Design a binder for these strands. Structure first.
Ligand SMILES: Nc1ncnc2c1ncn2[C@H]1C[C@H](O)[C@@H](COP(=O)(O)OP(=O)(O)OP(=O)(O)O)O1
Ligand SMILES: [Ca+2]
Ligand SMILES: [Ca+2]
Length: 1122
DNA sequence: TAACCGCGTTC
DNA sequence: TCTTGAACGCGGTTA
C-alpha cells in the first residue's frame, strides 16, 4: 500500500483516505451508507412497493472511491431525504470507460488483441459496442460505427490508459517508416484512429447512463434506483442561509489574518438567529423582529457569546444540530466562507472536522452532504439584471419587492461599539434578504433544472449556460445511441487569399437608428404613406385575416361569424390612407418583436451542426475575416527572420534557458509570427488588419438525425410555459379593482415570479445558438451560427421595408422594431366564433406575420415517420411570429453629437399609466457611471410626459435641465459635503488585478495605483476592485488619466491628505484642501453638457425646435446647418 | 487621425 | 480548468 516503487501509490492512498473522511462526516450529519436488502425477484418498476428497499428524495450526488468492503473502485454516492423525516446515502459503482475508433473495421480483433496486452497494467475489461456516427457515410440507413469500449475499475486507471495511448496516437500521424524502397500487413498500432468519450466527468457519466437526477424520488433496491413517478412535490430539506460581518480598518478591506468576526446572522427554515462576538459588540442584543413584508417573517433568537472562538463554536454546533442539506449565502464563496475558515485556523479549530466544509480546486467552499447555494452565482447567470443591479439592495428591491437595511461599510466597525442594535439590525436584514431570495427564486429553479440536467445542485448553480446546454445535448445523444464528438479546437493558423487571418466570425444582428426625439400619445406627427403598400396589403388582406384565424389562433374560418365585417372595417381604413397619403395626426407608438427569434429560425430551418453538409436546403451566411495585409511572400520573410532568433524556455526548471524557433510549439510559433506580422504591416502599409465580408452558401440536410434541434424545440417549449403563465397572470391583474390590494399584491407577486422564471430560461435557451461557436464545443458550426444571424437580418429588414412605407420606424435591433403608425391605421379587432368564444387580432402584427410565413417558411422539413423501413415525410415548418406590445404613451430616442448619426440600444418608453415601461443602455442602468448623469437621467426622462405641445414638453424638460446645470455652475453647492462627493464620484470596476494591466493607462488603473500608494499594496491584490475617484484640476495641462484622485483621500488624516494631494496635483504649496477647489469643473460641465445635448438639445433641432435649453450650446456642425 | 481597447450593455 | 454568440456606446490612449 505504502511501497514507494508503485505508480500512483500516494494518489490512491489519499483518494481512499478522502473517501473515508467523507463517509465519517456524512455519518455525523445523518447520512449512513444504506445497502438495500437482497431480493432475487422481478426487476420491473410496477409493484415498486413489493420490492424491498428505502424510498428517498435525491438531494445531492458526488463521485467517490469505495474499497472492496490495491486500488479503490469508482462509484457515486447519492444523498436522500426519506419519507419519515430521516436521511441516508446509497452508492452505485460503475466502471469508467472510453472508446477506441479503428480505421479498418475488418481488423478490430487485431487492435483489441494489441491494447489488451499494451494496457495490461490499467485495463480491466474490453468489449465490442456499436454507436450511430453522424459523420459516417450512410448512417441514415442504420449503418453503425464499431468501437472498442475500454473499461476500468476507477478513474485513475482510465487516465493511465489515456497517457499510454497518446504516444501511439501522435506517431500514427507524424511517422511513416521507409525500410525497403523497392517493396511496392499494416501494423496494428496504425489501425487506432482516435479515442472517444474519454473526457466525460465520471459523475455525469453515471447520472446519464443510469438515468438518475437530483430532484426526483427513487426507491433504492438491490437491482437499482426505481423512480417513484407518483411522488410529486420535492421533499423539504433543512435550509440555512447565513451572513457574517467582520471588523475592517478605516478605508481598508477586511483581512482575516487580523480582523475579527463581529456577528453571524442566519435563518433556518424561516426562524432567525444572531451570534455576537462580545469582545467587539458593546452589549448583549436581545430577541427582536425584522419582518420587512408579512410573507418574509423574521423572528431572531440571539446567542451573545464571549469571544470570536465561542461565536465559531456556536455556529458549528448549531449546524451539527439542525443538519442542513442546503446552506445559502450571498458571495459566501469569495468572502464569508474563507473568512470563517481563516478565523477557525487561528483559534485552533478545523472547519472540515466541525461541519465538513472545505475549499475545492476552484477555491469555492463545498461539503459532501450539504449544497452551498451562493445566491450571487444565480444573480450573475440567471436573474437577468444588469451588473449595476446585482448588489443585495437592487436584487432585493427587484425580486422580493422591498428596501432592505443598508449601512455605510465605514460605520460598521465603529457601530459595533457605538450602536450595536443598529448594526445587529443591518446584519439581520442581510440574512432575511438571503434566506427568502434562495427559498423563492434559487431553490425551485436549481432543483428543478437538476431533474433534467445531470449535475448536482452546486454545479447546476455555477456551470456556464453553454455547459448546461452541453449536458442536455449529451443526454439526447446518449439516449439515441449517437457517438459524442470530441471537443473542438481552433485551427492554429488559417489563410484567406494568401493573407494570414487574425480572426474569423459572421455578421450578427442587424440594428438601425432611424429617428430621434419625443413621440407621445397626444402630440401629433407627420406621415407619408406609399400607395403601392396599401394595394399590396389589400391584395394580401383576405389571406392575412384567414392566416390569423387558422395559424395564429389554431382555429378554422368555418366557425368565425364576423369575418367580412372585420375585413371591411380594415379595408375602409386602408382605402382612406391610399387617397390621403400626406397626414398629420395622433401617432400610435408600437413595438413588434419575434418570440424566441434564433431558436425558432433554427427550429424552422432544421438548423443544427451535424445537418451542415433532395435533402439539400441552401441557406446563406455572411463570413467576416480580419487578416494581415502581407502576402505569403512577406509572411515567409518574417518566419525566416524568427528562425535565426532564440526564445526563452517556458520551463524554468532546466539549464537550457534558450530555445530555437523550430523547438517552440506550432501555437507559440504562430503567436510570434502574429506579433512580427503586426509591426511589419504597420511599416509596409497603413493598417495592422483589413476586414472583408464574403457571402457564403451552405447545405442544411433536412433528413439528418434531429437530436440537437429537437433539444432546442423542447427547451423553447419549457420557456414558453412560464411566458404564458406571466401573460395569464398579467390578464388577471388587469381584471382586479385597484382597491382589493390582497388580490392585486398576490397577482403582482405571481407576474414577477413567472417573468423571472421565463427570463431564467432565456439565456440557457439562446446559449443553444451560441454553443455552436463556444471554445471546446462538441458541436461547433460557424456556418449554423451565421445562417441563423443572416436569416434574422433578412426577416427584420423585410418588416422595416413594410412599416417605413405605412408609418415611421424609429429604432430596430435584431428582431424588434419601435415605430409610430397613424391613429387611423387598422389596429385591434376581435373575431366571434359559433361557440360564443373570441380571438385577438392586431392587424399591424398579423400583416407582418402573414408576410413572414409567405417568405420564410421551410417547405423541405423532413421527419422519419417509419423508423423500421426508413420512410420520411416532408412538411412545411414555420414557428417565426412577431408579438406586438403597446400602444405606449411616449418614447424618447437620443441623438448623436456627430453629423447624421444616431444612438442604438438607448431609449425610454412610458405606459398611459405614467409608469416607466422600458429604459435601455442608459448610464443610469449601467454599473459605475458618474452618479451626476445617473441622477440627472433618473429625473429628466420622467418629465417628458408634462406639457401640452412639442415645444411645451422640450421646455418643461429644459426647466429640470437648467436646475441640474445650476448645481454644477456653483463650482460647489448649497448642500453638505457628504452628498457632494457622492453626486460627483465615479465607480469603475477593474475586472482583473492591477499587475495584469501593465502597459495600459485609464482612470481606473491610476485610481488603483494611487489607492495602493496611500492605503497599502494589499488594497489592489484582488480582482473586481471598485475604483471610486474624482478627477482633479491640476496638473492643468495633463491627460485626464492623471488627475484620477481616489475619493477616499478626502476621508484621510490631514497630513496624509495634504501630502498625497500635493504629490498627485504636482503643487507642493497647496494649503486649501476643500473638495470644491481641486475638482476640474470644466470636465463635469462638458459631461453633463454632452448628456443634455444627446437627450434634449440635438433631438430638438431634429424635430424642428429652437434650443429649448440655451444654457447648453449646439455643436458647430449643427449651427452651420441652421 | 485612425485605429484600437475595456467595460457593460441590447439583442 | 472552464469556457454561449455579435453589435454597440463611451470615453479614453497610441504610432
Ligand atoms: N444572451 C444571449 N445569448 C445569445 N444570443 C442572444 C442572447 N440574447 C439575445 N440573443 C439573440 C438570439 C435571440 O433570438 C435574439 C433576439 O433576442 P431577444 O429578442 O432579446 O430574445 P428572444 O427573441 O430569443 O426571446 P423573446 O423575444 O421571446 O424574449 O438575439
Ligand atoms: Ca453582509
Ligand atoms: Ca425577441
Amino acid at each position: 500500500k505504502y511501497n514507494t516503487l508503485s505508480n500512483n501509490y500516494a494518489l490512491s492512498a489519499q483518494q481512499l483516505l478522502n473517501a473515508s473522511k467523507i463517509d465519517d462526516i456524512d455519518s455525523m450529519m445523518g447520512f449512513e451508507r444504506y445497502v438495500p436488502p437482497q431480493y432475487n425477484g422481478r426487476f420491473d418498476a410496477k409493484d415498486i412497493d413489493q420490492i424491498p428497499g428505502r424510498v428517498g428524495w435525491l438531494t445531492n450526488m458526488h463521485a467517490t472511491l469505495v474499497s472492496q468492503e490495491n486500488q479503490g473502485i469508482s462509484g457515486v454516492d447519492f444523498y436522500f431525504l426519506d419519507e419519515e423525516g430521516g436521511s441516508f446515502k446509497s452508492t452505485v459503482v460503475y466502471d469508467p470507460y472510453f472508446f477506441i475508433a479503428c480505421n479498418d473495421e475488418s481488423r478490430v480483433n487485431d487492435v483489441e488483441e494489441l491494447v489488451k496486452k499494451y494496457l495490461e497494467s490499467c485495463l480491466k475489461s474490453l468489449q465490442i459496442i456499436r454507436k450511430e456516427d453522424l459523420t459516417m457515410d450512410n448512417h441514415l440507413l442504420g449503418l453503425q460505427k464499431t468501437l472498442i469500449k475500454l473499461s476500468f475499475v476507477n478513474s485513475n486507471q482510465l487516465f493511465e490508459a489515456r497517457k499510454l495511448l497518446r504516444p501511439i496516437l501522435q506517431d500514427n500521424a507524424n511517422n511513416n517508416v521507409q525500410r525497403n524502397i523497392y517493396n511496392v500487413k499494416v501494423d496494428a498500432k496504425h489501425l487506432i484512429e482516435d479515442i472517444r468519450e474519454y473526457d466525460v466527468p465520471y459523475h455525469v457519466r453515471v447520472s446519464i447512463d443510469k438515468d438518475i437526477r437530483v430532484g426526483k424520488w427513487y426507491k433504492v433496491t438491490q437491482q437499482g434506483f426505481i423512480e417513484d413517478t407518483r411522488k410529486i412535490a420535492f421533499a423539504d430539506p433543512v435550509v440555512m442561509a447565513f451572513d457574517i460581518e467582520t471588523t475592517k480598518p478605516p478605508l481598508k478591506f477586511p483581512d482575516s489574518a487580523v480582523d475579527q468576526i463581529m456577528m453571524i446572522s442566519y435563518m433556518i427554515d424561516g426562524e432567525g438567529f444572531l451570534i455576537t462576538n462580545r469582545e467587539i459588540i458593546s452589549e448583549d442584543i436581545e430577541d427582536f423582529e425584522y419582518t420587512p413584508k408579512p410573507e418574509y417573517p423574521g423572528f431572531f433568537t440571539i446567542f451573545n457569546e464571549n469571544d470570536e472562538v465561542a461565536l465559531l463554536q456556536r455556529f458549528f454546533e448549531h449546524i451539527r444540530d439542525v443538519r442542513p442539506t442546503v446552506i445559502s449565502t450571498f458571495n459566501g464563496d469569495f468572502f464569508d466562507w474563507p473568512f470563517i475558515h481563516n478565523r477557525s485556523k487561528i483559534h485552533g479549530l478545523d472547519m472540515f472536522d466541525e461541519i465538513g466544509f472545505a475549499p475545492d480546486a476552484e477555491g469555492e467552499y463545498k461539503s459532501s452532504y450539504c449544497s452551498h447555494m451562493d445566491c450571487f452565482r444565480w444573480v450573475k447567470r440567471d436573474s437577468y439584471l444588469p451588473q449595476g443591479s446585482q448588489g443585495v439592495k437592487a436584487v432585493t428591491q427587484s425580486k422580493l419587492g422591498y428596501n432592505p437595511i443598508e449601512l455605510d461599510p465605514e460605520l460598521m466597525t465603529p457601530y459595533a461599539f457605538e450602536k450595536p442594535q443598529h448594526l445587529s439590525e443591518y446584519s439581520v436584514s442581510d440574512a432575511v434578504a438571503t434566506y427568502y431570495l434562495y427559498m423563492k427564486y434559487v431553490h425551485p429553479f436549481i432543483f428543478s433544472l437538476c431533474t433534467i440536467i445531470p449535475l448536482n445542485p452546486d454545479e447546476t448553480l455555477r456551470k456556464g449556460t453553454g455547459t448546461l446546454c452541453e449536458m442536455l445535448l449529451m443526454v439526447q445523444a446518449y439516449q439515441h445511441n449517437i457517438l459524442l464528438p470530441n471537443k473542438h479546437t481552433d485551427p492554429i493558423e488559417r489563410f484567406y487569399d494568401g493573407h494570414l487571418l487574425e480572426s474569423e466570425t459572421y455578421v450578427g444582428g442587424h440594428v438601425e437608428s432611424l429617428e430621434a426625439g419625443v413621440f407621445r400619445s397626444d402630440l401629433k406627427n407627420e406621415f407619408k404613406i406609399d400607395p403601392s403598400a396599401i394595394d399590396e396589403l389589400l391584395q394580401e388582406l383576405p389571406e392575412a385575416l384567414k392566416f390569423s384565424v387558422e395559424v395564429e389562433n389554431k382555429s378554422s374560418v368555418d366557425k368565425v361569424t364576423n369575418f367580412e365585417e372585420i375585413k371591411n372595417q380594415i379595408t375602409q381604413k386602408l382605402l382612406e390612407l391610399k387617397e390621403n397619403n400626406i397626414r398629420n395626426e395622433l401617432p400610435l407608438i408600437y413595438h413588434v418583436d419575434v418570440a424566441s427569434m434564433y431558436p425558432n429560425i433554427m427550429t424552422t430551418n432544421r438548423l443544427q451542426p451535424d445537418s451542415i453538409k433532395t435533402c439539400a436546403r441552401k441557406l446563406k451566411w455572411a463570413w467576416r475575416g480580419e487578416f494581415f495585409p502581407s502576402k505569403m511572400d512577406e509572411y515567409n520573410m518574417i518566419k525566416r527572420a524568427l528562425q535565426n532568433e532564440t526564445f526563452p524556455n517556458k520551463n524554468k526548471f532546466s539549464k537550457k534557458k534558450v530555445l530555437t524557433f523550430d523547438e517552440l510549439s506550432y501555437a507559440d510559433q504562430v503567436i510570434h509570427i502574429k506579433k512580427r506580422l503586426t509591426e511589419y504591416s504597420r511599416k509596409v502599409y497603413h493598417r495592422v488588419k483589413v476586414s472583408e465580408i464574403v457571402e457564403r452558401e451552405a447545405i442544411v440536410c433536412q433528413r439528418e438525425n434531429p437530436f440537437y434541434v429537437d433539444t432546442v424545440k423542447s427547451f423553447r417549449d419549457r420557456r414558453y410555459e412560464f411566458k404564458g403563465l406571466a401573460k395569464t397572470w398579467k390578464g388577471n391583474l388587469s381584471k382586479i379593482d385597484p382597491s382589493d390590494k390582497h388580490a392585486r399584491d398576490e397577482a403582482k407577486k405571481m407576474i414577477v415570479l413567472y417573468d423571472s422564471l421565463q427570463l431564467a430560461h432565456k439565456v440557457i435557451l439562446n446559449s443553444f445558438y451560441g454553443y455552436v461557436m463556444r471554445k471546446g464545443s462538441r458541436w461547433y458550426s460557424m456556418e449554423m451560427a451565421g445562417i441563423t444571424c443572416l436569416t434574422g437580418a433578412t426577416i427584420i429588414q423585410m418588416a422595416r421595408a413594410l412599416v417605413e412605407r405605412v408609418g415611421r420606424p424609429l429604432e430596430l435591433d435584431t428582431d424588434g422594431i419601435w415605430c409610430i403608425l397613424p391613429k387611423s391605421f387598422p389596429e385591434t379587432y376581435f373575431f366571434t366564433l359559433e361557440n360564443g368564444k373570441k380571438l385577438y387580432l392586431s392587424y399591424p402584427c398579423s400583416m407582418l406575420n402573414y408576410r413572414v410565413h409567405q417568405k420564410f417558411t421551410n417547405h423541405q422539413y423532413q421527419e422519419l415517420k417509419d423508423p423500421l423501413n426508413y420512410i420520411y415525410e416532408t412538411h412545411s415548418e414555420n414557428t417565426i411570429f412577431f408579438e406586438v406590445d403597446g400602444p405606449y404613451k411616449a418614447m424618447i430616442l437620443p441623438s448623436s453629437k456627430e453629423e447624421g448619426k444616431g444612438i442604438k440600444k438607448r431609449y425610454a418608453v412610458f405606459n398611459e399609466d405614467g409608469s416607466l415601461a422600458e429604459l435601455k443602455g442608459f448610464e443610469l442602468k449601467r454599473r459605475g457611471e458618474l452618479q451626476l448623469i445617473k441622477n440627472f437621467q433618473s429625473d429628466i426622462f420622467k418629465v417628458f410626459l408634462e406639457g401640452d405641445t412639442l415645444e411645451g414638453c422640450y421646455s418643461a424638460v429644459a426647466s429640470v435641465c437648467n436646475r441640474w446645470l445650476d448645481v454644477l455652475d456653483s463650482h460647489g453647492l448649497m448642500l453638505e459635503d457628504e452628498d457632494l462627493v457622492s453626486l460627483i464620484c465615479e465607480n469603475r470596476s477593474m475586472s482583473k488585478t492591477l499587475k495584469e494591466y501593465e502597459g495600459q493607462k485609464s482612470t481606473s488603473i491610476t485610481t488603483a495605483r494611487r489607492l495602493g500608494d496611500f492605503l497599502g499594496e494589499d488594497m489592489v491584490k484582488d480582482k473586481g476592485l471598485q475604483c471610486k475617484y474624482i478627477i482633479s484640476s491640476k496638473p492643468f495641462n495633463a491627460p485626464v488619466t492623471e488627475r484620477a484622485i481616489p475619493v477616499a483621500i478626502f476621508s484621510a488624516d490631514i497630513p496624509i491628505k495634504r501630502s498625497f494631494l500635493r504629490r498627485w496635483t504636482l503643487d507642493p504649496s497647496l494649503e486649501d484642501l476643500d473638495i470644491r477647489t481641486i475638482i476640474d469643473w470644466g470636465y463635469y460641465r462638458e459631461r453633463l453638457g454632452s448628456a443634455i445635448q444627446k437627450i434634449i438639445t440635438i433631438p430638438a433641432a431634429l424635430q424642428g425646435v429652437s434650443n429649448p435649453v440655451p444654457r447648453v450650446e449646439h455643436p458647430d456642425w449643427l449651427k452651420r446647418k441652421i
